[PDB]
């Protein structure tokens, strides 16, 4: 289970969602399967569905744009 903190658009306080996939396999596909966000948002990270998400100490940090 990986903790993912994402800033939605530009809201003050971000969101924290736990994804039941250990951080070795944390994919954008998993992030989408969790969020189930209308299309088509873009994603950035702090550092494709098959590609993994960069996480240090089991924390993913991301940004979303509608």
């Amino acid at each position: 289970e990986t903790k993912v903190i994402y800033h939605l658009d530009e809201e003050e306080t971000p969101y924290l969602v736990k994804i039941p996939v250990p951080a070795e396999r944390i994919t954008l596909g998993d992030f989408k399967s969790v969020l189930q966000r209308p299309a088509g948002a873009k994603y950035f990270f702090k550092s494709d569905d098959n590609a993994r998400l960069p996480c240090f100490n089991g924390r993913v940090v991301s940004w979303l744009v509608s």
């Binding site: 903790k3 903190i5 306080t13 971000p14 969101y15 924290l16 969602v17 736990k18 189930q36 209308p38 100490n57 924390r59």
Partner: protein, 79 residues
Amino acid sequence: DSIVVAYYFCGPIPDRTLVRGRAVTLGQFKELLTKKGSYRYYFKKVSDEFGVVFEEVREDEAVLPVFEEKIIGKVEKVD
């Protein structure tokens, strides 16, 4: 014995309600709601686990976090 609740129903700031205090539960919050099943709940919590967040709560038995002296929350719908 009873605490204040204020949430966002996707968007609303519905009026701060009193809720009885036996540790307010997620199910205790969503029993105030109808036509659910596809709602999604977050609650502003003091945590910069490595400043504050809106942690998603999905279990009808989880304690709801307390911000300030209330339970500031945010419920939004899927599609």
